[PDB]
Amino acid sequence: ARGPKKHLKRLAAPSHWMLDKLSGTYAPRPSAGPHKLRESLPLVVFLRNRLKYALNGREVKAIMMQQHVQVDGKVRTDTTYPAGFMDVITLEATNEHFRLVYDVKGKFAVHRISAEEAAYKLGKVKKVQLGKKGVPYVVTHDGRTIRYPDPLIRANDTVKIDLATGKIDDFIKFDTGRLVMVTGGRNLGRVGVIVHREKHEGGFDLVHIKDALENTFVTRLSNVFVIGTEAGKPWVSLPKGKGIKLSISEERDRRRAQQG
Amino acid sequence: GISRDSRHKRSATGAKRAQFRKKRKFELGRQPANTKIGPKRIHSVRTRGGNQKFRALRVETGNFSWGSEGVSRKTRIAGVVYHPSNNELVRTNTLTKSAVVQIDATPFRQWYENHYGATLGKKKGGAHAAHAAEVADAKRSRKVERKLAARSGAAAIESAVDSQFGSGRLYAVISSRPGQSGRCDGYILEGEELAFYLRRLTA
Amino acid sequence: PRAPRTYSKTYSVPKRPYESARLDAELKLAGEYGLKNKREIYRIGFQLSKIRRAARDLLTRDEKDPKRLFEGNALIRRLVRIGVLSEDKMKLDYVLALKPEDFLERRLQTQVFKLGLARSIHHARVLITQRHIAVGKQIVNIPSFTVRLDSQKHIDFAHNSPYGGGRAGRVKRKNQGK
RNA sequence: GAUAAGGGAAGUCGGCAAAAUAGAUCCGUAACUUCGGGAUAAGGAUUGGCUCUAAGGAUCGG
RNA sequence: UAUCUGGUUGAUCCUGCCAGUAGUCAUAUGCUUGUCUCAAAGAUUAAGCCAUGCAUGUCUAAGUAUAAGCAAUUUAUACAGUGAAACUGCGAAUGGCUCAUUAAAUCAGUUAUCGUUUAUUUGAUAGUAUACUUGGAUAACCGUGGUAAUUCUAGAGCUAAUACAUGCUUAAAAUCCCGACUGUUUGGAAGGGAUGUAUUUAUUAGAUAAAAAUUUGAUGAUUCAUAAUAACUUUUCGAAUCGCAUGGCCUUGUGCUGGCGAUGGUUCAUUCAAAUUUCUGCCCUAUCAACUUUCGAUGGUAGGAUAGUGGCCUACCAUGGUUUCAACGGGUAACGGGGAAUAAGGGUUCGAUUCCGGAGAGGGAGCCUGAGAAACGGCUACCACAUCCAAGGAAGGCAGCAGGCGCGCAAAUUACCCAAUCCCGACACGGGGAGGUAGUGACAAUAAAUAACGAUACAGGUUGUAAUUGGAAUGAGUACAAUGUAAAUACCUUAACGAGGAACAAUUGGAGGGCAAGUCUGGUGCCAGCAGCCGCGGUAAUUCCAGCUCCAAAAGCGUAUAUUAAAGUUGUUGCAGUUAAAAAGCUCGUAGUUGAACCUUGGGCUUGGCUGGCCGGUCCUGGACCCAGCCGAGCCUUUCCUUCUGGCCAGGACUUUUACUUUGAAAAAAUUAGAGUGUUCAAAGCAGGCCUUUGCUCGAAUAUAUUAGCAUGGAAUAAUAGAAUAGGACGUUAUGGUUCU
RNA sequence: CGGCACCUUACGAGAAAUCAAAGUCUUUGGGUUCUGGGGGGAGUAUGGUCGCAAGGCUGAAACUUAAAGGAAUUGACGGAAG
RNA sequence: CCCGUCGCUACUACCGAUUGAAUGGCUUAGUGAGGCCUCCGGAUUGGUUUAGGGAACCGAGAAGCUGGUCAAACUUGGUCAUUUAGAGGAAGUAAAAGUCGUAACAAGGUUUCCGUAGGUGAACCUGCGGAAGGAUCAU
RNA sequence: AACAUGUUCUU
Ligand SMILES: CN[C@@H]1[C@@H](O)[C@@H](O[C@@H]2[C@@H](O)[C@H](O[C@H]3O[C@H]([C@@H](C)O)[C@@H](O)[C@H](O)[C@H]3N)[C@@H](N)C[C@H]2N)OC[C@]1(C)O
Ligand SMILES: CN[C@@H]1[C@@H](O)[C@@H](O[C@@H]2[C@@H](O)[C@H](O[C@H]3O[C@H]([C@@H](C)O)[C@@H](O)[C@H](O)[C@H]3N)[C@@H](N)C[C@H]2N)OC[C@]1(C)O
Asked: CB distance C2–A25 less than 8 Å?
């Protein structure tokens, strides 16, 4: 087709953006950036369709042209910036902070956080190898590259990064017993804890997990995001629900119970 | 133009395929360089992605390696004496990869004499004996004499390689691709491969 | 372009056009509820029919089943709320007994007729059409407007009605002055 | 016994006479048929000189 | 709603079709047409031809300003503000249109790149062995012009950069090669070179089976990454750029210095892409049975070419590759898919077209530029069309939007606008016929007026009564005003208006049967006509032509064609073959389909859960005990159920192959089924609701997908293998011998 | 035991005539081959193929049409019988 | 009740001299635009930079030239497919009451029918073998 | 022994 597409049709936009059908023909097309097109949430969606801070995209343009909006602390003006998993969005003018986290229903809930909290994030180790001049580095899930990591770090490990200096604070080894959070699949948004991992050479590795309530659920290894060291201790704040799935009758019961 | 697509060919069953689309630029070919031996002329080619290739149309000199000795020098190419794929390239001295060529043996001779102190050729004529007597009676300081002694023992080389040093031209194989890189580089023939090509040549 | 808008039909004509029994029954229903045409009978038949297809399938399932319980209870509650079903009939098996005489009671034409607002059901229809009726604080002009239990109490003349407080109307304002 | 601009059988009873074709290699070859043919059907391409390359043998000697 | 009815006969039971019936987001057409919400719309024939206009441009404080352009005198006699032109940069490869080509092609799910390119984005990332900052070109501009004419340009004079080409500013110690002298059993040393990163070639690291007589990354896997050595290169680049603030230090020199930034740059990573690519899956056709291989067909070696693999192409060589399990050829009124219509189930039919993938821009081909195009709102050429011309020449591509011609059964305005949706650019600002708003719009879909209420004598067995007497009510429509909106329109809201024949007058088809509703009156007289079918009509026509009444659906009803059900009249479920159509004259026989039985059965012990009642302990529900029932485990019975190491997991050594079935990973939205929601209802949509806030709030469910691929439990059914000239199985720590590590 | 048949019955089958298979078929599945899909046009035309020929095998379409057909019943008729 | 030829008319399709015609695809051969690569060329131009008058030799380079490569397109021939004219010939079907006979249905007045072969205005007749769907389930 | 034929259309 002669070259790269620059438009995204509304019906072809990822469903986890909850874009209404009849608004118009097109959808925001997330720019090339740190996260994949499909597994990211562009800033215009975050700052318009979630927070209702803007009535439309022109006012989104105006808001970001005034250095208000920040991603991972740095200032961004790209209206279609592909904000993704673990990203921290700072709004100093409103005195408000956020972190993109998968709510259990499968989306990015509006997760408010504190200023002290809005200064770090987490990163899965894609690979570890030597660059030029023999210097070792590890690649994270957000396109960040860090040189001179701990000589023990391997793939599938989570690291803590400070959003100011880009430095690594502390990390996690991947093994049985780790609190995690599924990154894709049908088990999206739910928080579990590693039970077992089954290794298929040449294939796709399988990992067995368990929620706080006893539920064993398997998932592709590539969708496992370690979020802690043990059960009950995440390294970030969790949304209203703590990542446990509730059946439709359960939620209906709870809605009736709450409303009287 | 020239194309590399597979759609113009018959299926493995033997069916004649129908036209699918017009020719695409991402499947082009180009003209062979047909590199020759002469004064250097190198033309750049703009390729896909903004990269560059170099069509060696004519080359004088190439960087050749004596593999065993761990040394390589920028000699000059005399001619083409054998090509595995077509005798038309040897008959017209066309340089491509894997062409058997003769190079100037002179710079390797200088390196041999300077790094060791012995000489090659081994022929016992007039000029050969005169140069041998000159080399054996050269002026060497005591520390250079001792470092050359530390380089002794392994001084002698295989009988086929040094025998050819009588003519000042060795046998080599082109290892570079002159049409792709603009370099005409290679390595000296040695051992089993050398015996194979000599058997092919003298015949 | 822009995504299509979903739509559908709300009735299906009978396969046999001239059945004396069915025709007579449909005329009886039209007369008992003052309906405009048979399509209003057809709509009740259609919607009750899809209800009964889904609800029959549910009744063919087992109890305590989440599909079964969830969908059946949702259907039962949506039926009790509108006044099609009553208080003691939340079982999913009374719905099969339901009749086009049921769904046709809940119309604002019938309800306006039943509680003294009109002298005849034809009068009730022409009052709703001519905008003299009000359901709670919302004025309604659609005869097929279904009234739940909550709006059963809240049907009266329009707040600004000639029959509910306000300037009477053209014939009055043209005759009473002389 | 030869040649002839442009035309090309208008000449003549009639293409009479003349012209045109032609060896060899490779390609390709219809109807019809007594299945043998028709067939060199029809219709195309190549061919000099020089310098090379390859293939195809005989007799002795375990 | 898993349904039938009319028609062969004097009558019957059948076969069997014709006819009737209902749907179609399925098209045309006739008649008719009041209101609202929603809404398809030159696909079908001609990927036919097109007048005209528009559809792609782009500037920030941060590239280049002597407009002889505009404003005023100002922290600015180098400029400094605004702002044309032009240079430079970026975009123009997106979008939108269409469905012509195309049948293992496209496409779908599923793979691969240890087989490649990738502007941009985002991370990183280079001190490499004239410098108070180098040159020369041209545009813009004034000036002479030439041609009939075009977005044609020529001479001449200036003048710039983030344009073009050049070029230094520089650490620290250290390694290596050469090595004049020199120590003297093998040292030191002057003096020369290379130090980065790119490029090409060659050669070495890149190790990790456990005890006797040192450091080392990743992968399932590599010649991987990375590193070293020797050399190589028409030497890649390691910043001669720009804006605002102007600080601090004095050894007071237009001193040394240093804040946010613009832009740029090598390599790697990432992101957006691309190009190939594995496995399985396409409609009709044998009046297509052999096809491919000259000139590449199938494979091997070597090269060339490519971004890269590969007969992609060349040279030499071999003779291979596909096919009745349907190759190859032919047809397609064939772009594929998500999907659509009908639907008891199984099916049948359709999919040009709102999303995804492909392909094309009159037909063909070839290229430039660029990260990316074999680009057509880019070029070049031919063919076909076609415009102008002063006859010398010049200029084209609506299957973009609107509009014309043609074609036909068949489809709308040369309108308004960037306000939403998003896209592009140097960009907060410019542009966008993409897109949005109106016009035409009985394609379809939702809701839904054409009336109603009382009284007289009447009529009748407490109202259900046949007419004409009145009071009222109303929106169809016209119109003050606000709203709506970019401005409007329309809806919604509303001053003054707006009904007795409320003439503000409903239509389309029917009245023998199928099939609901007349044997009433005239006309004709087997004529004219009706009639889907059976039939009607020949002077008493319930069927024609007409008037009255009635029936059905109704703002919609009828006709034509196609398709779906009815059709168990295509039959796998599920037909028929003696005589209704239909068993080959008869055997043999290959492919195909299909093929007897048989190999661990019983028995016992211990024990988890959830089912009913007995305890009953009842607030629908709760605990140990007995009873039984179901789904399970573990041991023992001659005993299957891999095997070692560390020492119920985690690294080694081995595994007969399949079908079938279980479970799971994952599988775009839209559509389907389906939970929540007074869009006033509903179709829909994905919202909305709350004491009325300067806030708070549940949401945007769930299943369906699975032929093929992946992972997984089971061992019935159906296959496959095994020890028969023993060339068989075991010997753990059997014995001896020969090799390797 | 195998064979050519026959008689009765009708559980069963069938539209019936009839059928020991034409039964074990809506309570619809032992294996497998072939053939038909209203009546005509028509086993025609065309292409192919076999044959000395006569012909055999393969084999359409346009168009046309409301029946054609099967089995039985009552009558009538018979150059049928009693 | 019913068969065929024959007569009038209408419609459909078939054969057919015309080496008929037209349209669309594929293709041998011949010619071949143009681009790209290559090869020289050298209008012009700045100096690797140097010369008493400037003589060398550096760089940049247009038109054009050589040889290739991809290959539009034209002619010729071939082949495939699809429409289509045609003297004449031979069918089929339809169409109240035309002609000739009476083949079939009854033992249809010669039982009917199948295959094959001859003959004949027409139905049809005859020979050879077969069938009962016969007019005989039987001596 | 001979024996051919019966306009069309119904009610
Ligand atoms: C000379 N032999 C002839 C033979 O040719 C043929 O005759 C046909 C005849 O069948 C045809 O007859 C055809 O058409 C006629 C027409 C009146 O419609 C009808 O009889 C009928 O439809 C049909 N048979 C006729 N039209 C031509 C003859 N040669 O058959 C009869 C025959 C006597 O044997
Ligand atoms: C039964 N066999 C018949 C043979 O008898 C003959 O029949 C004709 C028939 O064709 C004639 O009839 C024909 O011709 C008339 C008119 C044009 O004359 C038409 O109206 C009629 O429809 C048509 N069938 C009829 N009038 C006399 C019969 N003998 O026609 C040939 C035939 C078919 O072979």
From this structure: yes
Per-residue DSSP letters for chain C?
-PPPPP--------SSS--HHHHHHHHHHHHHHT-SSHHHHHHHHHHHHHHHHHHHHHHTS-TT-HHHHHHHHHHHHHHHHHTSS-TT--SSSSGGG--HHHHTTSBHHHHHHHTTS-SSHHHHHHHHHTT-EEETTB----TTPBP-STTTTTEEE-TT-TTSSS---HHHHHHTT-
Experimental technique behind these coordinates: cryo-EM
The tally of CA atoms less than 13 A away on the side-chain side of residue A70 is 20
Burial of A100 (0-12, 13-18, 19+ CB in 10 A): buried
Angle, helices C66-82 vs A248-258, to 10°: value is 40
Count of CB atoms within 10 A of residue A88's CB? 21
**Å separating the CA of residue A25 from the C1' of nucleotide E403:** 26
Residues of C in contact with A25 (CB under 8 A): 1-2
* Distances in whole angstroms, Cα of residue C147 to Cα of each of C81, C90, C142: 9, 19, 11
- Residue B162 to residue B67: CA distance in whole angstroms: 14
Nearest to A231 by CA among A189, A194, A183, A188: A194
3-state helix, strand, coil in chain A (%, to 5): 15, 30, 55
* Cross-chain CB nearest to C3 (options A11, A249, A252): A11
Yes or no: say if A98 and A236 are a contact pair by the CB < 8 Å rule: no
- Could you say which nucleotides of strand E lie within 7 A of any protein CB atom? 1, 3, 21-25, 38-39, 92-97, 101-106, 111, 117-125, 178-183, 186-189, 197-203, 217-220, 225-227, 229-234, 267-277, 291-293, 296-298, 301-315, 321-322, 327-329, 354-361, 364-367, 369-376, 419-424, 428-429, 434-436, 444-454, 471-475, 493-495, 497-499, 515-517, 551-555, 650-651, 664-676, 678, 680-687, 698-702, 710-711
Q: How far apart, in whole angstroms, are the C-alpha atoms of residue B126 and residue B178?
A: 40
CB pairs under 8 A between A and C: 17
Phi-psi region of A242 (alpha: psi -120 to 50; beta: other; left: phi over 0): left
For chain B, first and last CA: distance in Å? Answer: 43
**Of B14, C3, B196, which Cα lies nearest the Cα of A13?**
C3
- A222 CA to chain C: closest CA distance, Å? 32
Q: Nearest nucleotide by C1' from B87 CA?
A: E315
For residue B3, what is the DSSP state? B
Which residues surround strand G, with CB < 7 Å? B 1-2, 30-31, 41, 43, 55, 57-58
How far CA B65 is from CA of A155, A251, B72, B120, in Å, comes to 42, 77, 4, 17
Q: Is the CB of B87 under 7 A from strand D?
A: yes
Evaluated on CA atoms C101, C107, C113, C118, the torsion sign reads negative
> Could you identify the residue written with the tokens 């993704």?
A84
What is the rounded distance in angstroms from the CA atom of residue C29 to the CA atom of residue B109? Answer: 118
